[PDB]
């Protein structure tokens, strides 16, 4: 029993990463760069009707990602409480995390899947959740995240780096991550 | 700026550790006993103590008591202590607990640790540790150490600056009890905390605690209505900085 055990994190592919956007556009574009640079594919979504981005999420959801390391989701900048904000409705985020519980999607078993809420709970094995909350140069969160991610995504363990942005952004607010994480999480460069 | 920064924990005293322990409950709560709640206490007493708590334990208090003693205990100075440590072990639902004869929100509970009510503890690491859900019957399933297996039903939330919130169970998974050997959380957090607490970062450790209760299997012989009922532990952190345990 090693307390040192990693996700194994060399899959052909890092995996897919998905930015709802609901200023905002400095977020996205810098949450994009930095996704990227770590190997995700990242596609952005704006401002979608419900059954467009329930359609589109569950796309996702169903195709393989066997050959892949982990999944992001990132929702900004929607939710109040429990929900997010598509363009004609709030929408529960458990129901869009649940397609990605073991049960309903059999190849990220035992992958990490990680969902960044930004404001305007969820839960399963292997899933971290990363609150914003419990400018024309971005926003306090998102901006730390990136700069964050920047600087060590490709070095630190992800909850150490996400501890990091919560000092960060609480000297200026005090953003949160709920781990259900069962072993450590780098981002460590591939191939 | 340091990717390593630590809590400082070179204070005089290590901090206070809280244990309130919950086993039978008013009769007009319909509630179900507690079995192996005791063990869990005894077995986290035995671990904090290790780390240097003074370890302060309460069984089946009411509320109006308990209240007292929470409140009591958020009002002496912390300006010494390296952190603070306090343990549910009852029923619970939502966003309360249950005391001995009522039902108790932790908002309210933790509230009286935040910034502004508690001066003395700002900066400092406030780590609550919640093994909470509802008993309910039973079907058993046939015709002494038992499992008992019932669904997550607190809310596994967040709670303020420098708050560590660890729940035994998140939603839609399963808490399991033995009338025994106690929680399969307790328990397990003990034993890392036994191997690894004056070693390991916390927040690492409760990831190995996530890792061990996760891995648990009933033995469908012995416990056939319990498996496979998964046990997924959570921990909400709005730590600022890296949290060790090390000999003082």
Redesign the interface.
């Given at each position: 029993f090693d307390?040192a055990?990693k996700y194994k994190m060399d899959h052909r592919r890092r995996g897919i990463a998905l930015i709802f956007n609901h200023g905002t556009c400095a977020d996205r574009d810098n949450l994009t760069r930095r996704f990227s640079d770590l190997g995700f594919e990242v596609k952005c979504f704006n401002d979608l009707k419900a059954e467009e981005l329930l359609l589109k999420i569950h796309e996702v959801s169903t195709v393989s990602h066997a050959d892949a390391d982990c999944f992001v989701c990132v929702f900004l900048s929607a939710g109040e409480g429990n929900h997010i904000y598509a363009y004609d409705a709030k929408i529960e985020i458990?129901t869009l995390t649940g397609l990605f519980?073991g049960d309903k999607c059999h190849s990220l078993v035992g992958k990490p899947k990680i969902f960044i809420i930004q404001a305007c709970?969820?839960?399963?094995?292997d899933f971290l959740m990363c609150?914003s909350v419990?400018t024309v140069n971005g926003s306090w969160y998102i901006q730390d995240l990136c700069e964050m991610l920047g600087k060590?995504g490709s070095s630190?363990?992800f909850?150490?780096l996400?501890?990091?942005v919560?000092?960060?952004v609480?000297q200026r607010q005090?953003?949160?991550?709920?781990?259900?994480?069962?072993?450590?999480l780098h981002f460590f460069p591939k191939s």
């Open positions: 307390p055990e458990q519980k709970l969820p839960a399963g094995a609150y419990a060590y630190l363990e909850t150490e996400l501890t990091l919560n000092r960060k609480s005090v953003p949160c991550f709920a781990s259900m994480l069962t072993k450590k």
